[PDB]
Design an enzyme around this catalytic site. Structure first.
Site, PDB file in Angstrom:
ATOM      1  CB  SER A 153      35.963  40.846  41.879  1.00  0.00           C
ATOM      2  OG  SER A 153      37.093  40.318  42.560  1.00  0.00           O
ATOM      3  CB  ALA A 154      39.853  43.597  40.769  1.00  0.00           C
ATOM      4  N   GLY A 172      39.794  40.062  39.105  1.00  0.00           N
ATOM      5  CA  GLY A 172      41.121  39.514  38.970  1.00  0.00           C
ATOM      6  C   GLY A 172      41.959  40.145  40.066  1.00  0.00           C
ATOM      7  CG  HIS A 209      35.679  38.401  46.737  1.00  0.00           C
ATOM      8  ND1 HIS A 209      35.049  37.626  45.789  1.00  0.00           N
ATOM      9  CD2 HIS A 209      36.413  39.308  46.050  1.00  0.00           C
ATOM     10  CE1 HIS A 209      35.389  38.045  44.583  1.00  0.00           C
ATOM     11  NE2 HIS A 209      36.216  39.065  44.713  1.00  0.00           N
ATOM     12  CD  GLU A 212      32.515  35.091  46.662  1.00  0.00           C
ATOM     13  OE1 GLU A 212      32.049  33.943  46.821  1.00  0.00           O
ATOM     14  OE2 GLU A 212      33.541  35.335  45.985  1.00  0.00           O
TER      15      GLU A 212
END
Length: 220
Positions: A120-121, A88, A157, A183
């Site tokens: 991700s985050a 997120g 990413h 990714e």
């Protein structure tokens, strides 16, 4: 220490977290109790964010509880065998973690043996700072320092420009190593070994050094 740092949650055409399952199963080593940190999530409720994770991880023997659904989040982290941090917005994830007094406790618990899983985050959060997030600064986290569990900076990413932005960071912080993690890729830290995995090309950027392409299996 035991960390699994994923660039992202879902490969194209696959189920959210599907490529991570075998990695997690390989690393659990019998651990069951997990707390999910949903704070990076913005457009979906944290309550709902907690279920998909439990869904795919329950069969693996992981009992996932949302840190926003427990009476004493600090104690939940202190007792947890696994800390899972979803994707997120990285700034919101750090802001909430810090404001809630959970940042140091999460780092302490992982240092004491818990398995940390972040994508991700959540992969950004494991690093010394969030200076390599691609996210927009939607909220001020009151400091860019993060868990400081993995010593290198991950730019998840990754795709290239992005390298030019990373190079500017290297002008102001010349001592950093930045990993452009595409990714599909991940870094699994286990039994005293940080290993790169995934089918796509990963890059490393250091000040004054040409970008270096890293192959799956590369050990940091």
């Amino acid at each position: 220490m035991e960390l699994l740092l994923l660039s992202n949650s879902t490969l194209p055409g696959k189920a959210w977290l599907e490529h991570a399952l075998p990695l997690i199963a390989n690393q659990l080593n019998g651990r069951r109790s997990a707390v999910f940190i949903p704070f990076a999530g913005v457009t979906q409720t944290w309550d709902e964010y907690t279920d998909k994770t439990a869904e795919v991880l329950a069969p693996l023997g992981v009992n996932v509880t949302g840190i926003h659904r427990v009476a004493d989040p600090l104690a939940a982290i202190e007792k947890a065998e696994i800390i899972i941090v979803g994707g997120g917005n990285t700034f919101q994830l750090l802001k909430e973690s810090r404001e809630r007094g959970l940042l140091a406790p999460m780092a302490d618990r992982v240092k004491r043996g818990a398995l940390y899983i972040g994508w991700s985050a959540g992969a950004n959060l494991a690093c010394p700072t969030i200076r390599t997030t691609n996210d927009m600064p939607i909220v001020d986290p009151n400091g860019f320092d993060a868990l400081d569990l993995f010593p290198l900076q991950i730019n998840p990413h990754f795709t290239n420009t992005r390298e030019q932005r990373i190079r500017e960071l290297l002008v102001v912080a010349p001592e950093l190593t930045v990993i452009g993690l595409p990714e599909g890729n991940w870094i699994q830290v286990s039994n005293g070994q940080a290993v790169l995995g995934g089918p796509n090309t990963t890059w490393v950027f250091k000040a004054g050094e040409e970008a270096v392409a890293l192959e799956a299996g590369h050990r940091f």
